[PDB]
Structures are given as C-alpha cells and as structure tokens.
Amino acid sequence: VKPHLRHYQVVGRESPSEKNPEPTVYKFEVFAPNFVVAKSRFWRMMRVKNKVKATHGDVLSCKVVKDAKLVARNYLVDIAYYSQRCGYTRMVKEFRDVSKTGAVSQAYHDLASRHRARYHNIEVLNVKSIPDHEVKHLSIAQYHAPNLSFPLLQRRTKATRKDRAIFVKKNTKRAVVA
Amino acid sequence: KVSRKSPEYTTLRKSCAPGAIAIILAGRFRGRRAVILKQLPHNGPLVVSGPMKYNGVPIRRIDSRYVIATSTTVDISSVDTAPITAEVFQRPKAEKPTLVSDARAQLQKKIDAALIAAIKKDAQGKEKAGYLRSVFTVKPGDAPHRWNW
Amino acid sequence: AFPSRKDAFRAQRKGAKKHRPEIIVIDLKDHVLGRAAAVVAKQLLLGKKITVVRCEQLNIAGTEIRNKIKYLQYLRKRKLTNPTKGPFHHRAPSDVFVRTVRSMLPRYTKRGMKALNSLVAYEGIPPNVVRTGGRVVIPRAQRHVCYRSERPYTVLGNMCKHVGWKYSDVVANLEKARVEKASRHHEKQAKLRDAWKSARKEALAKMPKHNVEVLKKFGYA
Amino acid sequence: QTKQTALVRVENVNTREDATWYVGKRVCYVYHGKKVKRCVRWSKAPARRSTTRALWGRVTRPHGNAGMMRVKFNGASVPASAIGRRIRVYLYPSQI
Amino acid sequence: KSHYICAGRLVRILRGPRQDRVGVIVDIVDANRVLVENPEDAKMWRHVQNLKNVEPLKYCVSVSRNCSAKALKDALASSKALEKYAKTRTAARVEAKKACAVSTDFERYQLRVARRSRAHWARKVFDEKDAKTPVSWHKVALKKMLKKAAKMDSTEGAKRRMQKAIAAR
RNA sequence: GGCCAGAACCAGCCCUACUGCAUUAUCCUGUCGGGGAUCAAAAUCCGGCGGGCAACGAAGUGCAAGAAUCUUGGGUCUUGG
RNA sequence: UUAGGGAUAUGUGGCGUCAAAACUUAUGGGCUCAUUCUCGAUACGUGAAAAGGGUGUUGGUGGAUAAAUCCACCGGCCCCGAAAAUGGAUGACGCUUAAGCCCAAUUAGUGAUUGCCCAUUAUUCCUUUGGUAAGGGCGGAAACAAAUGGAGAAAGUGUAGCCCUUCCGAUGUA
RNA sequence: AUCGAAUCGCCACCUACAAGACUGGAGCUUGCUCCCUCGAAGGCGCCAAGUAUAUUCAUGAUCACAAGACA
C-alpha cells in the first residue's frame, strides 16, 4: 500500500509591517495527510519557535516533494514523541523502505504500536537514506546479505474475491456453497 | 432523424440485429436458440424463427427483453423476410363464444428453406446448425453475470 | 423419526420413489469451533440442511487445561432452588457444537427453532452418512489457516472426555473400524479408477481432431 | 425492519459488481395455498390450475459488498413465511 | 514445493490488478515487501509487491540486488525462464482460465460438444476393455454368477423347464 | 372494462461512464572522484561536472466547468404522461 | 430534535453469528497469551482498583568493555499485587494467521482523490393542515337541441373550503 | 385416496486418509539443481449415445409457478 503521509515543503513568513519590513522566510519539512494539516503544523512550529502567529503571517508555498525512484534503502528517522509521565522522548530508528514518505509512515505506525503515540504528539526531526555499513541495528542489517533468501511459511492464502466459497469439497476445489 | 411517428423508427439495441442467434428466455420455447429475422414496424417486437426443423421454434414474435442476443450471427441477406408483416400475426376476433393456416404454413416453409440454406453456406455451418439444436439451461454453479455472449 | 404407517401407505399409494433432501455434510475435523459454528448458523438461517460429522475433532485455541476450566466454570451454573430445570450441561462434542450454534441463533423464535432443527451433529462419520456423498469443509474456519502454529490448541473430544463424556473410546473404536473399512474399499476399486483413467486417455485418440483441439484450447487435453 | 424491501441472496452472486448485473431483473416467490384459486390462463390453459401461487417483484439495487440484492414486490410486501425460502431470479428483462 | 524468496526468483501475482502475471524479484525491501519487474510484460514495470501477493516459482535467474533493467533483460533471455515456464501445466491452466473467462456462448457450446465426444469415446473404450477384463459392477457380478448359473442350468429339469416355457414365447 | 400483467416511447428527476488545465528539480539521467561490499564485482551512500519531461494508464498533487446529443447507459411498483 | 407517506443521502454507532452491513475487506504496519469473579474488548460509567513488584516479552536513552557482550535508566502490552456471601454475565456465544490493543486504508506503489449498513435528521417528490402568507381569474367569448366532449365559475374570515397558481411552517406538560 | 401442491444435479470414477514448518521424486551444495506424470481441475450431465447426412415440433398466437419433473 502507498504511504498515508506525504512529504510537504511549507514556505512561509510573517506579514511585513512597519517594525519588520523584510521578514525572514522559513522553509519547513512536514509529513502530513494533506496540505491543510501541513500548514497547521507549519504555523504551530512558527508560533512555538519564532513567536509568529498564523493570523499575522502568510504562506508563500505549500507544495509536495515528489518521491525518488523506488529502491530498497535504509532510512534513518530521527523522531520525537510526547508522553505525560516521560515528557519528550527523542529516538533514532532505522527502517527498510523504498521511499522517505514510506519510511516516515512506517515510523509513525511503529510509534503508535510500541509506545501508544498519536500523530499530533510526534515530531519528525529528520529522515535520510543511510548506507548499508552505517546501519547499527541487526534487525535492519540482516537484509544487507548479498545472497539473502527465505521461504514463505505459514501463509494464509485467500482466494480471489470472485472465486471465494463458503463450503468446498474436502480434497477437491469444487465449491458447494459459493 | 427518423420521426417517432414513422413505422421505420426503432430504438432496438445493436445486439438484436437480423441474423443474430438469440437464446429465448421466456415463453413456451424457453431455453431454445432462434435466429432473429427482423423487427416489426413502429418499434414492434422481434420476429424469430430458429428453423423449426432444428429446434421446433416456428415463425414467432418475441419481445427483445426476453431474448439474449449472442455475438454469433448468420447471413440473412439471402432470406426475403419481406412477407413477414405485422398483419401475418393478426387474427380475426371471436364473436360471443396443431391447426395452422395454409398462409402461415407456406410462409414458414419458404422462410425456413432459405434460412437453412443460409446456415449451410456459412462457414462453421454444421457447427452452427448443431448450435441451434442445443438447449440453454442454468446449471448449479453457473454464473451468467460473469459470462460473455 | 420412525415413519408412520399412514405415511408409508400414502407413499405406496402415490408410488413415488425414495427421496432424500439436499443435505450438506461437513467434515468438522480440524475446524475452529466458534468460526465453524458462526458459518453453520448463518447457513442454517439461509435455509440450508446441514449434517456435521467428526464433532469430536473440533479445535479450540488455548491449552486443554484452560478450556477444561472454562467448561467447569460453565458447569458451575445451576438453578439452586431446582437444579432440575436449570441449565443442562451436555458433555458430548456434538452436543457442545449444537449448543454453540444455538447460541448464534434466535432460539426463542419459530424461525430460529426451525434453523436449529435443520442441523444434525455426530461423533465420527456414522454408516448412514458415510456413503451419502462427498464431505465438505469450511476454508474460513480451518485450523491450519486460522491458528498460529506455535500456539497450543485443544481437541474438543479430549477436552470433553475429562468433563464427563463416556463414549470417547467407543467413538475411537468405531472411527478406527470405519477408516479400515473405507481404506479396504479404496484399495479395491483402484482397478476401476485406473481403467476409467486409461479410457479417458484412449478416447483422445478416437475422438475427432477438432474436438481434441478445442479440448487443448480450453485446457482439458 | 421495513417490510417494503426484501433482501435476496442469489447463488454464485458474491460481489456488488455481480449484484449490479441483476438490477431490474424479475423476481418470483413460488408457494402454494390450500385451495385452487384463479391464475393466468385459467381458461386458456386449464392444465395450469393448481394450489401453486407466485408473487412477483423486481431487483432494485445491490445490498452490501457481498452480492446481496434489494427486491421490491408488486404492490405488497413478501410474507415473512418466505424467509429462508427459495426465490427465482429470472434473466429478463434482458439487456444483453 | 516451497521455493525461496531470493533476488531473481520468478513469482506469479496472486491477487490484484496484476494477478496471474509473472515477474522477477529484483530486490528485497523487508520481510513483507519485494521489488518485482518483468521486461517482457507491459504492465510489469518495476514496482513493490507485498510478499503475501506473490507465489514463488521453480525458476530463479542469476541477478544481483537492485539490478539494472538491461541486466534483468539479459538474464531473463539467457536463462529462458519464461520459455520454460510457458511449457508447464499451471501456465497452460492460467491461459485456459483466461480463454474460458473471455469465451462466448458459441465457444461454450463447442467446449461442451468436445467434452461430450470425449466422454462418449471413453465410454466405448471402457466397455471394450470391460468386456474382456471385468472391472465394472455388472461385469464382475456376471462373472461371479456365471459359474453357478451354468451349474444350476445344466440339470435336465431346468433344461426341460426352459424349453417348455420358451416354446410358449 | 373503472381489472391484472408486460413491453414501447414522452417530460422531469435520480444515479453512473467518458477529463482537461496547472504543478514536479530533495527529481531524472550520464560521467568522474570518493566510499562501500564482494571471489571479483555491482548496488545502498556521498561529492563534483554535463544534460534533462521519470511524462499523460508519469505522479495516488492542486483544481476541474468533460451537453448520456453526437455515441439507442441504467433507474423511476420513488413522479406524471 | 418530532404534519403523513416515498425515494435518495447521511449523523451517532457499527460491518464473526445473534443482527442490517468486510458472504470473517486489503494485494496495511506492529503489539499481546492472560488455569475456577475463568486476559482483553462501550466514552459518560472507581457502572473496580492502587502503592509496590516481574530474569514474561519488545521498544527507547545514556555509559562501559571487546567476539559481541553487560551496566544502570525509561516506555509498550501481559503477569503478580487483587478476599463475600442464590448460578451468571465484554452482551450472549465465541474470538487468539482476533472477532483483543495502538495506528492507517477503501479495493490498494495500477495509473488519483464517495468500501458498506442503520435515524421521526438532510435533500427531493406526493398529500394534508395553518399562515403577519404571495399572486392571478371572477362585465359568462364566439359558437354549440335531442335521437346519439362533459360539467362548474360564489368579489369570497370560517363550508363539500368561489376557482387556480406559489411559498413557508407543522412535536409539546401546566 | 383424498392430494392440487412449495422444492428444480446426477454418479456403481466425489462419496478413503493425512499434512500445511507440506504431501511427485532425487542429489548435496540445504537452497539451489535435476528428473518426472512438470505439482492450479472428482467424473459426468446441458437435447443426433455424439459431433454428422439427420430429424417431429407452430394456433400454447409476445411476460406470467416449467402448461413438467423417474436424469
């Protein structure tokens, strides 16, 4: 399945005024389901970092960043999440994926599964494609083997939806109720 | 272009063309295979006569909604089909109350003779002759919605 | 059950031959109890007549001791004022399956009671069921596709034999005899099956070549 | 429940795309009464006279993703005694 | 049997819009996903496939991980894996399934005629063989009954009883 | 016939098909240098430098207004003829 | 949020059976095994639980040492803490390649942006009723026996409402 | 014997059995190669008992429970 998060580059600034005739222009990296959430995250970051509110600023661009050609790569994702008891916890993880958006979506799913963290309590600090020899975790390093192979065992193979049946003869493919 | 009041007006689908072999879905000869000859004027019913020698279907009129027009066709241009008019199937009204008229038997005999010859002349004529003798039935496990006709 | 003399005389008078309704026989060996029960309950509500055999080989997830303790907790429930007319705790695997299916049905309506009465359950495959026709399975409810193989499971017959089921050995002996008889008959008739296979092979050399061409086009030759 | 619309499950129709093929087809519930009453061709075809009766309807739309169809019967609802019973889905009005 | 998921392994797509199509594994992303490409198929460009949607085949061409399209084409052509696969019975079954799916009413009638003719000639061959060496129920029963019938019909009372009640027919 | 049923056509609705415009570059190539891993490689990776449309069944990104008339879609026992 | 009926959409809530809907969806990702109040699964509703612990498993963070180790420290789910009186309640069954939990889809790296099911809600159609209702017509238009197109037409609060067209509202204790 | 019914696949090739971390068979290299019957069909049935040279079908008049049902 394609990733549920998209790579957005949000470029914006504060609205020029008499105190600030030439405001600084900020570029922002976000992974969001849509550009509305992308702009919301951009303005949250501008408010909590540069003391600029969305009501006193404007957005020069909210474009998407196209993914590179699909290649099996190792992606280092530096990410952070908030919990009430633990405060802010920052971690760095390695993922095997074909795209930056895919790796970041995998990271979001992993954080939700293992730490019960939702999208709005997670800040992605960085995502980058690292070489094979810089991978630290063995769970990711095990896919660097030049001759890597394995059989598919314990596979629940379902029939095509048009050919699925309720009652099938015991040792034949004949369907009794379908 | 053709005026709705004119007898030459049809909205019949493309599949129910003259010469097409059609499965009869309802009526006495259900499941049989017939040959579509013409459509009666004023957007009337189709006229099918799968040669009565083959399947027993006489020259009959059938609604196009009770027939599956297949992609298999037979060249009808050699068959007259002109004597089959709407007045052939009209009957006198009874007053305060198998046998076939000689005109209807003659029309069937002449049409079927030219219809059988058109099948023989056609390539795969012996296969299509036996195709019309076959009977269509819905079997256990059949999925006509997935089929191509 | 046993036919009335009126029914027998009426059948003779009408002269109709023997009749058997459309009954689906399900080999319940290595099937998940709840999933098979849900599928069978829906099919029974959809007007099907269903016989289920080998109910002693149904599977439940978890340890046999855990499921035994679950059944003992079930057995703990009884009407204190009058245990007779309280819950009735059946120990046979077919009775367990029938209770499970009944709990998936509206058992307090006439429609639900007809659906429940449309079901027949057995231990093993009885003689009146052996030769009726090919048994069927429920792919949605088979253990080898429903259970992680590393997890333990229990067999319904083994679980039931330790809560008060007396006929485990009887069913085992009858099933052993049935399999021996069926294996003997299958060792026989092998000549007939091979003769039919050879006849099908030899027909290809005597039927018309264009018919063989159609058979090869559609994958039957 | 709303008895004006009925749910019909046809054999080998297990997808919504399959159930869309039958939209508009005629539907029949065949049963019998206790006495022989009037029928079509009561005089033309006396062989048709029987305790056999039929209620007709049409397929209106599919129901769900699993090939069910909604059916509306002519003028009146189908009896609740027909639930779990056989229904005939005819191949007409043909569109092919 | 079970063929390993390796770089170069030929797979068939189980379900989806690419079903019944044959591709070659060119890279392994993780435990769940692989990269599949087939230069000889129009719709089989380099794409990501979940490992639940592939069926490993017995053929495995010699390529490296993340191989180029030209290298994949050369390896496929040299190994002749597609030509070898086309000769199997499951590939022919897939093609026959497609033909049956696209078949018309006339084609269905033709197939029915072919199957009926094969059944008729199988019946004739079986009857010929069974007349010589009995395998059917009726022929085995006749073989069993023949000796007893010959013994019990050779008696004079039997013979006279036959003659007398045959002369009346 | 003021009954029952089926097909035709009208009008109005209600569903579906059929898609163009703008974007892309953290991208696409080639080639050098590194770096990597191998039996040797290749690749993942990082720099230069030269190109450039990953290209319309490219992209799951913005917005789409495409007369179901051409080109007899479907439905209306959900309307009236 | 409520005139009385249809169609089509939704909302909250759902799609293993009961029970409509994934005939147990995906060609999505992880986590979890729980032996007698029997793991868990509905907010509100501690409408059941802590302090404290676990060499259960799987994730982080900072050290250390060198074939990879081991040291403290934080999550996640599970377990221990955790005892009441009729037999009993995730809702019943059951579920554990979940039918549990966290996240994410909508037919799945194929080619875009509405899976499906349920309201006295929305949109629309028909009818009623009542308006702080809005308009038209109302000087018989000419003609026109039967045997063999027709009727009616009231200057009007309220009627079988003078007729026609239009719009909007309609639940309710005292 | 009322009684008219609803129901619309036959089999004497399915109607034995087991397994999915497998269940065509080898090899050793243990995930590849090789061989095979090539690992994705229970058999029939569907209108000439069989694939051709046939042959009766109407007026049951265009839908109606198939107006019939020992396959």
Ligand SMILES: [K+]
């Ligand atoms: K007791």
Ligand SMILES: [K+]
């Ligand atoms: K109609």
Ligand SMILES: [K+]
């Ligand atoms: K899952």
Ligand SMILES: [K+]
């Ligand atoms: K009014």
Ligand SMILES: [K+]
């Ligand atoms: K008045």
Ligand SMILES: [Mg+2]
């Ligand atoms: Mg609705």
Ligand SMILES: [Mg+2]
């Ligand atoms: Mg349901």
Ligand SMILES: [Mg+2]
């Ligand atoms: Mg008035």
Ligand SMILES: [Mg+2]
């Ligand atoms: Mg009031």
Ligand SMILES: [Mg+2]
């Ligand atoms: Mg009848």
